[PDB]
Design a protein around this ligand. Structure first.
Ligand code: ATP
Ligand code: ATP
Ligand code: I9X
Ligand code: I9X
Ligand code: MG
Ligand code: MG
Ligand code: ZN
Ligand code: ZN
Ligand code: ZN
Ligand code: ZN
Lengths: 353, 278, 248, 353, 278, 250
């Protein structure tokens, strides 16, 4: 007859060893360092920080190395690590006006105060595979202009001064924190922005692309995309006064969106907002576009696309949840499958009879 | 003992306290899905994070932990969860349902009847029994609140009309304490009767969906059905090929491409208990 | 005590759109028809008195209990067990994806029915009582005609023998024969089961044959009230005179 | 007064140099090699191959290096390179039964003929950041079992032999090639599968997750996930007989899906199919789930979720298109913005009058 | 000459031939969006791939290529496209509309009137003028086929009713040859009249959407409007601050945070032509 | 020649569901009412003869041209310019997101109208002709009542003065006064503009006052046909006798 044996634990251990060996790869090649990933794969690091929830470049690069380059796995690793960290403080609200700029562009005006700073970007590159990278090369010597940074007012501050757009006013409302309480639909805009920042880049990009193609359009213009170093400050209880704890490289995107004509005020442009860690800006743009799409209840807009369906967008945006639940089908399901089989075999035997 | 560098059971005291409050609220409101601020675990969402959190919040040094997946202690994920709990708590573990104080289970209730002071913790993908009828939480929350379960009865009636049977074979909805329609987790219809007037506390954890719900001991759990279509559990024409039991839930093991198969107990502990007794 | 008492009920989308200062009483076993020019607020009043629209002013008592002072669960229970509601559009009171048998049996199961065979038999009987064949029980209402859908929504809201049934143009889309078959059914239920009916309609013949009392609405204001026979044969308001004269 | 000056070209060149320097990063660290990325970041390479359309590990790793780890940019680089390559042959249809397995699991049965081969996987790992990877380590010594590969019949062949599922039959229909002609909606299943394979992992994962949560559910079970080496063969015209040109590492996922009860045949399970390059399997699972969702017209299913909306899913699935069109907002749009402004300024004056 | 290692104009002969057939079909069916098997270019989709493909398919060694974006030759993307074409073709380039044989443009028609034997190639994001009314191609294809443009007229009527004006300010729909409603690309209303009975061939390329359409020389192009709401072009209270022209499309340049701004010609070549003439 | 000729038209979803072997003729200036028990196929026949449903058998000629032998574009043009179609559900022949003025003016612009002011004036006039106030022109039909929506769909399909108008229960949901106001309008259009009408209704009074000829359908079969007065006052088929007897005498 048959006797049951124990095979689960050793199979698990062998599978983990196989995965670790595959991660190391050929041993003749030197092992990758987290520093190399942080420096040279910086955009993947940016995505992993933004979605995993920690603005620590080294940790995100470590997760990428551990995940064998899998962005979803690295993001989940970073989020799991976040769970183990004590919250020491809450930052004072970020002031993007103080950003030291690496890149500042505006699509709405040819030239603006402070100028069109392209900065480090792949924009306008010819996407031809560069086979010289197959071998070691020499980094180019950078041209140097004047060192001063020109006054860079937010383009939306220029639009609002003309009455074309409305200033974003602070009423002192306490932001919702979906990391402490589960989201409740309909969610506040603070909760929506927090979720979108953690949301999958591809999902939100597809939703925004759909909005551009008529599935809940909002007539977007890139009013300003700002990337640079923004200082973080906290008010520790031991001292009672603000202390600057460092700077973070972040990208801010502001979208002008289709004007509205309210009954009691002049017609004005609407707007969307995106904010991400690092330089990767398409995530911020998609965040702004989906934020504007989800603003439909505020503006009484009739939904014409899934991007405006708040629950559908947000409940499936976090790739931690989505990847976990899709991959969970790999788990043994033979008890549930036996139940489905037990019924089908009967409905097959009752139809034939 | 715990010698891993993490807090006992890997949860910070604030998260444990919040989950404990949620557990008490769920016990006081049987069948109701209590939202809780679930955290991301070392296991991916959809791989038992809710059950892990519940066990971590309830478990103690003196508890004997039993972890089973598909009814088996040696299942991959059950092994992973048990090893994690051994690492971060050091508690004693057992494969015997009788000797367990805490049972964390995925998709099976043990064949061995549970006893007083035992807690069985279920891992739940979808805490909302009405989800597949109404995917939106905004509607199901109000349906729960106003006891509007008319959509489930219609679903059962239509299933009978279309097939002659109720299509649902696992995660079969059950009314709790005469009020709340509840999802018992993806356990088969075979196990649902065990829930009724059980002398053990039942806890249900949906980590990804951020819900916790519970059934107190000695609580009425009635599977939704009709008088002329009474609740019928899965049945097999063969007994277990190892122990010969005819009363256990059976898993089909395919032995070859020629179609030779054998049916064996999913509850491996019960299978061993029967085989040793001969 | 009146089964349903409405006092100074008002709900206006805009001046002249809706209803305002509407009061009346309804006892068991009598029918209160409502007539008026299209857009007079009859539908709005019907929704307001059927717990489907919170009034801006006034009050509604049902069995000595304020309708909107109770919890939403109690109002839902009333609309689920002992209150019928026939809508002007038949599909509003129907489930498109659910067969006719399922639509009728939802109401039966809400009342405690848990025997599939009896539910199916009652659904077939009622489908036949409203002149739909029994073989269509498993068919979805989307495949039914407008009159068939309306007669399905009547069957759905009368299968539970509710105490109070609100109707909006129930006879619309029905031929004269099935119309009279549905009026006779309502009269039988009213006389036997003591059912109360509040019906909004334009066909004055249906109100005359069915409505015990009649109300006349114009520009959201109740202009005339009293017995159906007196109002129809001896109208006072000019609009009522015009409406009765228009009768073909 | 003002005079116009030329600044576009030099700004572009400086921006490209800045991006290249940032890609190189700190020069004290050795430059990353494409071989290291291919070996140790293999899952990112898998995604880039699958979505870029070329099953060349070295090229995908080169694109990742060139893209500074940006998966979207690397995918677009690979697709652009694909455009420049002559098509030398069309492979004979792949035979996954001949796959040399690295990993074979089934969620529907506890044990199957050939067994549950976990292989290299992160499944059942505790996602705790491994800080030992911050320094060089030693790869584990792999345990060795018997070298023979057990007969591994497809689980769906076991289900179909019992009548529980239907064999996928070949009618000789010529597959649609959306790389040669633009997609026409409704698309054939061949076109749908081709597009999904090229589709964004995150977008399709979110759609599949939504289907699991009731937005167009199809009751999925992972009938079998197979990863391994599959031989590619071509029939060159110079010879007229099949020649084996090599092997490709690929992952195949087969999903059992909710049974149907056709009027004239016994009730049976439906199915979905996914196929990807490399080992990354969640893409294949999402592909299978969305394939089943898009099978709604064949089965006459009433759509209950966006995942079943074929045009919405497919038109926005390709992240080349989506990323390009979202990023295009960065382009100067001041002519179009001036038009919108010219109108809004007139509407403001008229409202105020 | 071409010394880049790629085929002349970077396109393989099969792709060029397919695009050429599509161009001929579009010319024979003015206003109709001809699907074509567009390929991925070194530029991202949505950055002018359709126009690049059309130019590559039509361009020759003897052509003089002019590339303008927002009306300016020095615009970033225009510079990139012109440099790519210089690399892969080696053709002569010019900033003068008069001296150009091929003009690839994004969002502007040059102020200088076009002449015979000139081809102007437009870059089109959305080739379907009805897309923002009906996002689905399955419906718009049939709307084009059955000449059912009632949804556009209703849109214009509703825009007038809501605002008193037609909200569309660029990519303004135009009827071509009395039959086909066409999107002229996101050029402003200012430029639409230039399309009517032009002596130059107009080609429109939507690479991402895989469409090509064309307007032959001397073809009727009529912007949709009403008699009491006639088509009115953009107007500015100021002339160009550099050349003083009152007849050119103007771009607003913000000089400081204090709100000082100047309006200058978007068509930089026309601005230079006027300034030199004094 | 008849304006609309139907020969052996048939379309059945299942035996007894739909219509079969239906033939008749319609000349300009006359109204052809259709009556029968609910579910008799009146709506199916109306859709089939209005180019909305391809018949399984038979033929339809319009001005010596087979209705379904022409291209889809020609049929769409007919339904867009010179053919009115009032649906049993008012919202079917209405645009929810488009105001009443827009709904009425779509039909005017399809006929060549390109003056916004004249379109608006005509829409206001017709809103008033069907008893809806002019100030509701900018309001969406979703905010209208059922009778208001039905009277909007009549105004929408009569603003262009079509030659042939198909109606399905046009009088449903309308009070007697506005019903008679809408019957008088139809009579005026028919006598003056020579409009042809094919109306499906259950109120025999409307058919008597309007329908020049009458058809009776039962189980998808045309049982009785001829003049409205003869059919109503001197019925032959038993079902027609039952239907006339059911009339609620006042
Ligand atoms: N949401 C709304 N917003 C604005 N006005 C509305 C709204 N709903 C209804 N109205 C208007 O309120 C008035 C009352 O409409 P209601 O549907 O109650 O009329 P009714 O008498 O039942 O109609 P009928 O007998 O013609 O079906 C009408 O003018 C209607 O246009
Ligand atoms: N899609 C469908 N599938 C099956 N049966 C259908 C379908 N549509 C209609 N039927 C049936 O065909 C018959 C004709 O219906 P139809 O709507 O034409 O009736 P009618 O005489 O116009 O109705 P009424 O006067 O009550 O509105 C009815 O039995 C209807 O149930
Ligand atoms: O959300 P989590 O992390 O707590 O996972 C709960 C359950 O969801 C998945 O679906 P499953 O029931 O097949 O088993 C898995 C798991 O046990
Ligand atoms: O699809 P492609 O690649 O041919 O890009 C065509 C057009 O789409 C984008 O939108 P735009 O009009 O603002 O300018 C861009 C570009 O010129
Ligand atoms: Mg009404
Ligand atoms: Mg009908
Ligand atoms: Zn599962
Ligand atoms: Zn056993
Ligand atoms: Zn644009
Ligand atoms: Zn100038």
């Amino acid at each position: 007859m048959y006797v049951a044996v124990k095979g689960g634990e050793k199979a698990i251990d062998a599978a983990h060893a196989l995965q670790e060996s595959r991660r190391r790869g050929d041993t003749d090649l030197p092992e990758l360092s987290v520093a190399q990933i942080e420096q040279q794969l910086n955009l993947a690091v940016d995505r992993v920080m933004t979605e995993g929830g920690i603005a620590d470049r080294e940790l995100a690069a470590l997760a990428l190395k551990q995940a064998s380059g899998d962005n979803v796995e690295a993001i989940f690793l970073l989020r799991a690590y976040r769970t183990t960290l004590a919250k020491l403080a809450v930052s004072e609200p970020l002031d993007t006006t103080g950003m030291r700029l690496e890149r500042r562009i505006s699509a709405v005006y040819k030239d603006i105060p402070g100028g069109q700073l392209l900065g480090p970007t792949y924009d306008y590159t010819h996407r031809l595979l560069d086979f010289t990278l197959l071998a070691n090369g020499e980094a180019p010597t950078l041209t140097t202009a004047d060192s001063e940074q020109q006054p860079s007012p937010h383009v939306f501050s220029l639009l609002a001064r003309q009455g074309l757009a409305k200033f974003e006013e602070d009423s002192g409302a306490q932001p919702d924190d979906i990391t402490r309480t589960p989201p409740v639909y309909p969610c506040s805009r603070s909760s929506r922005l927090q979720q979108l920042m953690r949301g999958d880049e591809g999902y939100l990009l597809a939703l925004a692309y759909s909005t551009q193609r008529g599935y809940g359009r909002n007539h977007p213009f890139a009013g300003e995309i700002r990337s640079g170093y923004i200082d973080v400050s906290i008010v520790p209880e031991e001292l009672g006064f603000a202390v600057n704890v460092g700077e973070l490289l972040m990208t801010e995107c502001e979208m002008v969106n289709g004007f509205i004509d309210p009954p009691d005020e002049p017609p004005h442009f609407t707007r969307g907002y995106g904010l991400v860690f690092g330089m990767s800006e398409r995530k911020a743009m998609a965040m702004a576009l989906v934020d504007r799409a989800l603003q439909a209840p505020e503006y009484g807009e009739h939904a014409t696309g899934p991007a405006q369906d708040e629950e559908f967008v947000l409940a499936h945006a976090d790739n931690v949840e989505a990847a976990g639940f899709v991959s969970h089908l790999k788990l043994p399901h033979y008890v549930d499958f036996q139940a489905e089989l037990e019924l089908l075999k009967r409905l097959q035997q009752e139809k034939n009879h | 003992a715990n010698l891993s560098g993490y807090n006992f059971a890997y949860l910070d005291e604030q998260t444990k306290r919040m989950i404990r409050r949620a557990i008490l609220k769920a016990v006081a409101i049987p069948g109701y899905q209590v939202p809780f601020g679930g955290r991301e675990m070392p296991m991916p969402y959809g791989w038992g994070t809710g059950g892990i959190q519940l066990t971590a919040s309830v478990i103690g040094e003196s508890d004997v932990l039993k972890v089973i997946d598909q009814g088996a202690d040696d299942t991959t994920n059950a092994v992973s969860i048990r090893n994690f709990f051994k690492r971060v708590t050091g508690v004693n573990t057992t494969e015997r349902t009788d000797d367990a104080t805490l049972i964390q289970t995925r998709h099976r209730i043990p064949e061995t009847p549970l006893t007083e002071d035992q807690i069985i913790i279920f891992q739940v993908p979808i805490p909302e029994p009405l989800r597949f009828i109404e995917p939106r939480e905004t509607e199901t929350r109000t349906m729960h609140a106003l006891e509007e379960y008319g959509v489930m009865q219609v679903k059962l009636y239509e299933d009978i009309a279309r097939f002659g049977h109720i299509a649902t074979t696992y995660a079969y909805p059950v009314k709790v304490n005469g009020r709340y329609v509840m999802d018992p987790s993806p356990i088969p219809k075979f196990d649902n009767p065990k829930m009724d007037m059980m002398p053990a506390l039942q806890l249900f954890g949906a980590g990804r969906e951020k819900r916790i719900y519970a059934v107190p001991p000695f609580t009425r759990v009635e599977s939704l059905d009709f008088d002329d279509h009474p609740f019928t559990v899965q049945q097999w024409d063969e007994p277990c090929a190892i122990c010969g039991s005819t009363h256990s839930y059976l898993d089909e093991v395919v032995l070859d491409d020629a179609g030779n198969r054998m049916f064996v107990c999913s509850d491996t502990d019960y299978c061993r208990q029967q085989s040793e007794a001969k | 005590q009146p089964l349903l008492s409405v006092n100074n009920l008002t709900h206006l989308y805009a001046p002249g759109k809706g209803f305002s200062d509407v009061s009346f009483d309804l006892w068991p076993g009598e029918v209160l028809g409502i007539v008026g020019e299209s857009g007079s607020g009859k539908t709005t009043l019907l929704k307001s008195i059927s717990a489907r629209l919170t009034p801006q002013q006034g009050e509604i008592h049902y069995e000595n209990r304020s309708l909107y002072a109770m919890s939403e669960a109690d109002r839902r229970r009333l609309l689920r067990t002992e209150w019928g509601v026939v809508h002007q559009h038949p599909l509003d009171g129907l489930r498109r994806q659910v067969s006719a048998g399922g639509n009728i049996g939802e109401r039966l199961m809400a009342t405690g029915a848990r025997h599939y065979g009896d539910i199916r038999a009652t659904a077939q009987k009622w489908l036949e009582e409203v002149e739909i064949p029994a073989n269509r029980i498993d068919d979805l209402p989307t495949t039914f005609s407008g009159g068939m859908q309306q007669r399905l929504q009547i069957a759905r809201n009368l299968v539970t023998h509710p105490k109070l049934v609100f109707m909006d143009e129930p006879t619309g889309g029905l031929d004269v024969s099935v119309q009279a078959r549905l009026l006779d059914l309502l009269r039988g239920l009213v006389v036997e089961l003591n059912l109360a009916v509040v019906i909004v309609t334009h066909d004055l013949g249906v109100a005359r044959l069915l409505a015990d009392r009649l109300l006349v609405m114009k520009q959201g204001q109740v202009v005339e009230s009293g017995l159906t026979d007196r109002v129809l044969d001896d109208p006072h308001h000019p609009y009522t005179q015009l409406l009765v004269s228009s009768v073909l």
